[PDB]
Amino acid sequence: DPAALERLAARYRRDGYVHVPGVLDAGEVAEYLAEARRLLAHEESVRWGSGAGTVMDYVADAQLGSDTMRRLATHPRIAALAEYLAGSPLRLFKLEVLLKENKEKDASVPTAPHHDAFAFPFSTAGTALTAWVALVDVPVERGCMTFVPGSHLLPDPDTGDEPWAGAFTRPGEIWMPRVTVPLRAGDCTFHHARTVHSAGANSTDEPRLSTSAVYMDATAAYRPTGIAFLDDLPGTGADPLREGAPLTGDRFPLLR
């Protein structure tokens, strides 16, 4: 439906995020859920966290080891929506499998507000787009996301040491309204790289399971952030990548 798709993009451009219900059907939810759980149970995951507690555990570049996650990353529906919203052809940069859950010694904590854009090591970072796919039901108390509508239109934050920093530092910004978006299993959000967003702690006893996939302009090139763990891209060859090197081929596949 063209009109519907144009209305969706209109919302995207105004707010910097959009909620799309039922982008996966129930069988797809169960497939991708099963694999997400398999990967978190058997592959190596990264802890994002601190002495305050775990923000999440995640499987980095989950699409390189799992053909199933690669199909979720390049899912035709998600991909057609992404390109229509971004307005130009795209490539996958990465997909991560995300987990917030409470453990005995380690209570889930919120994902603090942040600005993803310049934490992405590519030339078109400022216009990147993220698809966050719910694989279980994510009501507010399970740690759904909150967005600041229109925040993608603000001047970028003053360049700190942290490329993801500077949410709620622009003039007037703290006075902007904030939108909390619970999601059902198989819904996704798309959000712009400059859109400020957060997520709650998971205060329930059922894990929050989702994937987050970053999409970039089809012509993007490597741009180091300065942070080693963001800049060190696996499956890109023996040697470190050089600034301005194209991100092409099967490693960074065309969505189309």
Ligand X SMILES: O=C(O)CCC(=O)C(=O)O
208 annotated among ligand-binding-site residues: yes
Cβ at position 162, least distance to ligand 5R6 in Å = 6
Cβ at position 219, least distance to ligand X in Å = 22
Q: Which residues form the interface with ligand 5R6 (CB under 6 A)?
A: 48, 50, 52, 58, 96, 112, 114, 116, 119, 164, 212, 230
Three-state SS across the chain? CHHHHHHHHHHHHHHCEEEECCCCCHHHHHHHHHHHHHHHHHCCCEEEEECCEEEEEEECCHHHHCHHHHHHHCCHHHHHHHHHHHCCCEEEEEEEEEEECCECCECCCCEEEECCHHHCCECCHHHCEEEEEECCCECHHHCCEEECCCHHHCCCCCCCCCCCCCCCCCCCHHHCCCEEECECCCCEEEEECCCCEEECCCCCCCCEEEEEEEEEECCCEECCCCCHHHHCCCCCCCCCCCCCCECCCCCCCECC
71 annotated among ligand-binding-site residues: no
* Window contacting Fe ion (CB under 5 A); options: 18-26, 43-51, 55-63, 116-124: 116-124
Q: Which residues form the interface with ligand X (CB under 6 A)?
A: 56, 98, 111, 116, 130, 132, 197, 199, 212
116 annotated among ligand-binding-site residues: yes
48 binds, among ligand 5R6, Fe ion, ligand X, none (CB under 5 to 8 A by kind): ligand 5R6
Residues found near Fe ion in the complex (CB under 5 A) = 116
Binding residues for succinate, as ranges, are 111, 132, 208, 212
